[PDB]
Enzyme design. Structure first.
Site, PDB file in Angstrom:
ATOM      1  NE  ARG A   1      16.540 -41.080 -69.283  1.00 39.06           N
ATOM      2  CZ  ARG A   1      16.892 -40.534 -70.437  1.00 39.06           C
ATOM      3  NH1 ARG A   1      17.914 -40.959 -71.143  1.00 39.06           N
ATOM      4  NH2 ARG A   1      16.170 -39.543 -70.906  1.00 39.06           N
TER       5      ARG A   1
ATOM      6  CB  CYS B   1      15.958 -35.654 -72.584  1.00 42.36           C
ATOM      7  SG  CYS B   1      17.354 -36.495 -72.165  1.00 42.36           S
TER       8      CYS B   1
END
EC number: 1.11.1.24
Lengths: 240, 242, 242, 242, 242, 242, 242, 242
Positions: free
Chosen positions: F123, F47
């Site tokens: 995600r 991330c």
């Protein structure tokens, strides 16, 4: 909401002024028919004339294997007082039991509840198998014609035993008199056959009939009706 | 689940072999009583004896201000053929309407589908008065034809009790106790019972058992005429007349 | 709400004028197809014309191994009188059973209470094969009689389709594309499609449209005979003959 | 669970290869009847024979004031490609709209999801009048092409009965009893029956079976022409002419 | 409402233009991954461009052990005609199956009935590994064609992550921080974190950001080949040489 | 239970490290599209590589009229520390807000708790237009960083398609059939399809496959540049200097 | 809806920055009490002061047979960075585990989502004995640090109460009435109240108020050392030396 | 099921030994805070020690503007006899009111029926501010008397935080890190955090850990006196001189 013809009388314990009994079992187990007739209350004049009318035809009912039992929305203690009063002032003893139904538990079960508080005049003719065969609901203001209940059970027993159907007004039907009807054929084969045997008087394949009832069965049925039509020789308010 | 004595006849539109009518308005409008009697099926022998019996007493009913109306699960076309059959073979015309209730919608609504039918209506009888209120219900079995003279007695007695403001004893007009007597409705309070006993204005056996004889001699002889007929062996059977 | 095509005929006991039978078992048992047709009421003209038309074609149905069974919401006794009437005034015996459906219990189970009805059952037709499975259902309005010959064409084509393993073109045996030819069920995979084309064993307009002519001349001419009859002006009306 | 004869066609918007339309309004508002016919899938041989057969009778329907609309569970793109193919290989242009029903929302609303079916539409036909009312429903199986001339006979005969106030015998105009005669709706009351018979204005076999012959020679002939077409082997098969 | 990343692909039988198959079983049983892509309808331009793009990368999929399977709400017959058109007009054979989902049973099961269309499935992609687990889902709008090379990259990178116990950074194998390096999963406890930093075995920016370069030069250059192909202006367009 | 393509982004208030804001209202009001991207947790390597890759492309997004917003299930104080870490150790300032979603209320509303999750957000990516409408959703596994250049290609093409009234072929601007062409949305009626062809106003392969090239040179080159940037190994990695 | 004084600590698995553990089982197994304290977020100033205060008293808790476990709605990765920050900037190692409760599963289970939150867990304390039974719950507001010396006094006194079968007066060991005395549980029957009084074994104010001094001098001086420490200004503040 | 910090105290009328009062209205109206503490029963020793302890600190509570109100599941007549007892035997008058809660109505309402009782209320404390909002709840077990000085410290510390817009560190005014300093609530955006640090307006360990010393020296020493009193061994026990 009531019981239906062809249904078995609803199972119940009831308190009468003769004791506690189980219905229809009490009568079924003796091979007895019964007539249950209800009354809105003790010490009421129409209901008393009916008690007296039933008492009179007690022997007539018994001779056909029919027990009688009343139903009123009053306690057992009032029932016995009412009966005592009938015997003392009218001179007639009321021999069959009366169900004590305060609370109207029995009345409700049978859908006998203009009523709210007091039970319609309902009559259930129940055969020796516990099966409701007829129901008459007269209004509170109108007394029963008790000789018609006798004609019903007599005709009914003769139909059950002779395997026959019973014409309007039997034994005095305008078309076939004291004749009794062969139940109609229900198939074309059965119809043709019945029409080819020539074994019955007939008007069509669905209307055949014969005269199988005994002379005494016809005269007894006719005797109930004759009594219903006779002007009473001396009234019972005079006897008093 | 049946309708109840003392209830208004259930409001409903019905198809008869005389046309579409509204119950009970159609008779109420005319200020007529009506007898509604049901039948399991057209072209059945007990039910044909009953029609014949009803048609015979048709004028007796008219005189009392009572209309007659039938009910069968059959169609209107069967009703008409059945009636044609009766007139031709028995020699009797059926004057009153028969509700055609295929499907049993009317029968259902009146709880006339009992526990020996499932398919054909019980012999039900509803005596509905000029106000459209059910006053008597009779349920005879499939195998047993009605005594139509008793239906006349009921209407006659109920019209008297209604007009003369009286109650009617068992077996009227031949009650073992008060004969032709009609009964004064009982006091329902203690003062009223005392007043009634002190008035000396009724014959009586007790404060709750009072009566007079307020019925015309013709009112009474007519009630006995019904019963006498019911008791009479027919002289000439209509089967022979054919 | 109804039975569906490809569904087994719902199990039921029914009362007919020939007796009580079990559907579809009674016919499955015998290795027979059956055609069930429903009629709003007895002693109605359209429905009498249809009875006559099915009676006329009774042998054609026997040849196909098809039994016929009617349904009307009217008692068994009306069914029988109605049949006596046709035999007596038209001179045609109605040899098949008619279900007595007072109450419309059977009609209701089959979803044969429609929106022009309420009282009397749609003119419904269920074509049921020897396995008890519904193959075709026809719903004609109450004012329009059926074309009985088309019911014959359907059974005959369907039996031919079942046994030859074939689908039947529009208007068979007179399809405007392939005449009396019968359709090979189309390939459902690309390899099936490609194989069918290379086999050149069938006439074809595309891999999905292949046909041949495996029906016997007799089958074809028997199926055309039904439509020919339906097309013919009658040579003598039963009305006159009456 | 279906729409019912006598019932109004369900209100719905549909997408077709002619555009979006509202049913039955689009047709009601033109004073048109319509036949909706459903098909399991595009590019299948039975359904192609049926489309060509309808397209071939296009002008017959148009003369009767009847519009055609198909329904297939396939996209609008497949419909056009399918139509294009039929026009290219069979030489017949398909002039009428087809409903694109991917998802089967319309099929489902109409109950055309049967039990051979799963995902592909039963082969159902709805004949709907100019009031937007379902008048007839036919359900053929997947493997059996319809007889489209019977659909023309139906609408022709229904239009006749509606405007002449008549019922239509079985196999009209070739009924075995009364030929091309049409039926007078039977009387539903005793008084009507008796009056009908007193009038003597109709041929009759009974008070419930009267008819006359009010259809034009042209209407009767047009009806016979549909059945003759259904019965005759075509001169020239469209496949030969490919 | 849809199935989820990490969940096993919903069990189901489906019909494709190659046959009936169970998902994910048909693929799991072969130890193969599959990419299920869905399409609104046959004979559509964006969707045809996609099929051609997938067909072109088919061997690239097979090298990865990935089978392709389409999904469209249209019948098997349309799919085959659609494929046939592509091979004919574009010169490219589509070798993979397509689910025929008339009715959209499969679409609903997978949540593919989104809002732009309650009739044609959104354009969704499920990437499913050899254990029948959903690894990735993509939902493009119905107006925008997919980038098939990005699907190749996802599978390749994900098979590498799995086999190397590594996570894959953004834009791999061109990440701006670590290039072609792969990320060591972060320590989840204080003891792991301490040990990781004392081990000195990885390149690191913090205890939770460690990486190495364990992928073969072949794995890395294969993945970059995909992105390069996607970035290349094509030499000769297929419409020209149609 | 996810939001759906074609649907409005669900109304909601959220807290970000830039303050509290209403979605999608905050961006609709500015006439802006936005990309919402979610992340399982703060201080995680993949991330972090995404936040950096998005930061690099911030200007590319502003030029398209597009804002970025992240989402993570971590407090706002973690977000700020994490950002400050990236800026201090990697040297990239992360300019866009991140939603703080402790409790996962936002995550559940968006259905981002997927099967590998329970606790950390799948995600997911929502591309939302300036009307508040969801136009694309991507769901990548926790272990696989996104390809940000593909999100910029999607909005660039979606915008061109929206304004030119066009559909976008696979792999645009490098589609193998038509290159940089854009697809004319297909006709949906026979008439439209006929007129399209009659006109001959477009290159085409069929009536349902027409295209032209109305995108400018610059639009085309901007989109090819995103793909080129994805394909090329970066000159210089940040960990080098970092 | 919360856990309750006298109930077992709810059964649950939790993820901490030391690893996954089962509560209360993990402590119960070891014959240890534990104190669970919750914190609305990482990198918050009050909650850091707390960690530090508990860290300072860690040995005091160990001597009592008590473990400490914190709870914060933030990921494990934040917990570890936060803890690193404290050790680095403040000079104190936080030796005990912290539960990572992203989503607040544990927080909802324990009822720690109070009104001033929806997003951030109240500042709550559960004191649980070595049988796993909750003995005390404190709920401080987010803006007010706990007094950790009071938590030691509670468990020390609860331990004396349990082992000596005594109740503990207000402000023990410094109660104004009875000093370091411990309370004999009062009689609940009259016989018991007479017995206790006639035996004259305890100091007493009434039959319901008896006490003695069964606690050792070290137990007393220990409890009083916690309170002294709460009252004294630390000789050295950690911020100066940072 | 308890009330929650942050939530307004549940509105209710209660009976006390001083009269009937509405909560929280009765104190809100006076601009007073109130501490409501519960007691399992009258004439119990631990609960008597607490009453005395509160009565002792009564002016300390008045100085802070805090009223005291007890609660016990016993009639108002016991409350008064119990108060007289304490005054007569211990020499201390209890000046605050006690709610009489026979039945446990208030206690149920406030979740004060826990799992060691079902009959007698847990020992609970609710600290409620001048706006009627619950600020702190404490739940001690029954065998363990409260530390009333810790309650003074909470209200004193809360009122200071409120008025100075500050958060209060652990163990204040004796915090190990910042001593008597009070915490600046942490920034919640990146702008605030940067600005905060640019101002050099505060002592700080980080942008989220800033503090100063705004409390008057009298506030600081008043708070610490509370704790010194709790740590002092009593110079004279109340039982001796009883």
């Amino acid at each position: 909401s009531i019981p239906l013809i062809g249904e078995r009388f609803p199972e119940m314990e009831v308190t009468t002024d003769h004791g506690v009994i189980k219905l229809p079992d009490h009568y079924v187990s003796q091979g007895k028919w019964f007539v249950l007739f209800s009354h809105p209350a003790d010490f009421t004049p129409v209901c008393t004339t009916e008690f007296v009318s039933f008492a009179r035809r007690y022997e007539d009912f018994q001779r056909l294997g029919v027990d009688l039992i009343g139903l009123s929305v009053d306690s057992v203690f009032s029932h016995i007082k009412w009966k005592e009063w009938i015997e003392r002032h009218i001179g007639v003893r009321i021999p069959f039991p009366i169900i004590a139904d305060p609370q109207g538990t029995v009345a409700r079960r049978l859908g006998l509840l203009e009523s709210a508080t007091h039970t319609v005049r309902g009559v259930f003719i129940v055969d020796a198998r516990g099966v409701i065969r007829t129901m008459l609901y007269y209004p509170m203001e109108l007394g029963r014609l008790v000789d018609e209940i006798l004609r019903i059970v007599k005709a009914l027993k003769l139909g059950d035993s002779l395997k026959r159907a019973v014409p309007a007004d039997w034994p005095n039907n305008e078309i076939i008199g004291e004749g009794l009807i062969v139940p109609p054929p229900t198939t074309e084969d059965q119809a043709r056959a019945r029409m080819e045997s020539g074994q019955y008087r007939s008007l069509d394949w669905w209307f055949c009939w014969d005269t199988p009832a005994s002379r005494d069965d016809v005269e007894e049925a006719r005797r109930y009706l004759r009594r219903a039509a006779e002007k009473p020789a001396k009234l019972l308010y005079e006897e008093a």
